[PDB]
Design a protein around this ligand. Structure first.
Ligand code: DHC
Ligand code: MG
Length: 329
């Protein structure tokens, strides 16, 4: 049957990106099939419908497009309750941390997310250090490195670690590294794959223990007005492909793509070196991490927010969904 509604989905990553290939294409396929063609989904990668990645959230909210995928922290100050998921050593896997992020959003961010229908509120998989030249074997090695992070709280951590943070969306990272504006970038390994950085940032540092260095909250966001405009028999077709299960799935795709990329480097199929900092060394980065946590909670409280409560709930949810994933397998 002919399209009753065409949904334009706009994002900042290339079509070859794992989340595009393994989530957005199947999402398109299921929405079009289950709607018997009454819903058409058009995917627009690489900012093909214009603007820059910080503009994405409002493109969906304001209805310039129907669906976006973005980083909430690309808009500094805008999603203060979401910032709890940027904190050091809070996250585990993409899969578990995403499910925690979706539940957290549903229970704490109803005001912050007013005007968008959340298909998935999720995080990326473990954030790691990627550099052009410097093998980071110790805290001292990051001193004075120009490092790109996605958000003011990850940049805050990078500065407390003794780096020089330069805030920008990861889409500027290729050119900035190319021209010597950056020494490197934090991102998960699947983002290395996506952005074609494997042959540029060839030094990679990961950590010891039951928590990743950091992550950041992302969103697959639908214009609430466009959802509200759908007939009562097409709204449930969206609902069937929206919520915490979708967030878990996005995190799982990234986790799997991380593993492929890390294996490819370790095997010598792709040039690079992976350096895992031992327990004692990691403990040094976690001790700085705690100072950022303590600071954020104090900042939050002075500003009215119950930061301590939001931090306790975010950490409880990560542990809950991590243990549930661990018990199953
Ligand atoms: O740090 C950033 O600015 C973006 C991070 C990001 C974006 C897309 C992904 O699929 C992913 O794993 C990480
Ligand atoms: Mg709207």
């Amino acid at each position: 049957q002919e399209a009753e509604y065409t949904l334009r989905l706009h994002h900042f990553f290339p079509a070859s990106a794992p989340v595009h290939q393994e989530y957005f294409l199947p999402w398109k396929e299921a929405i079009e099939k289950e709607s018997d063609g009454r819903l058409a989904v058009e995917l627009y990668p690489s900012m093909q419908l214009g603007g820059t990645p910080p503009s994405l959230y409002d493109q969906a909210k304001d209805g310039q497009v129907d669906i976006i995928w973005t980083v909430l922290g690309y808009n500094s100050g805008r999603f203060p309750r979401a910032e709890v998921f940027d904190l050091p050593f809070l996250p585990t896997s993409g899969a578990a941390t995403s499910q925690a992020a979706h539940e957290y959003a549903m229970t704490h961010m109803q005001d912050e997310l007013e005007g968008v229908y959340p298909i998935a509120v999720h995080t990326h998989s473990p954030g790691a250090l990627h550099t052009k030249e410097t093998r980071i074997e110790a805290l001292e090695d990051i001193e004075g490195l120009k490092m790109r992070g996605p958000s003011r709280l990850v940049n805050r951590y990078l500065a407390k670690l003794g780096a020089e943070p330069i805030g920008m969306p990861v889409a500027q990272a290729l050119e900035a590294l190319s021209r010597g504006v950056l020494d490197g970038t934090v991102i998960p390994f699947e983002a290395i794959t996506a952005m074609g950085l494997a042959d540029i940032t060839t030094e990679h540092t990961i950590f010891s223990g039951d928590r990743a260095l950091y992550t950041t909250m992302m969103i697959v966001a639908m214009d609430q007005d466009k959802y509200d405009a759908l007939p009562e028999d097409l709204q449930p077709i969206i609902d069937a492909h929206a919520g915490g299960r979708e967030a878990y799935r996005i995190g799982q795709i990234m986790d799997q793509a991380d593993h492929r990329q890390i294996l490819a480097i370790q095997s010598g199929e792709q040039p690079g070196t992976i350096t895992r900092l031992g327990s004692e060394e990691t403990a040094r980065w976690q001790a700085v991490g705690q100072e950022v946590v303590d600071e954020w909670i104090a900042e939050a409280e002075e500003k009215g927010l119950d930061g301590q409560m939001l931090y306790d709930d975010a950490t409880r949810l990560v542990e809950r969904y991590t243990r549930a994933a661990a018990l199953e397998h």
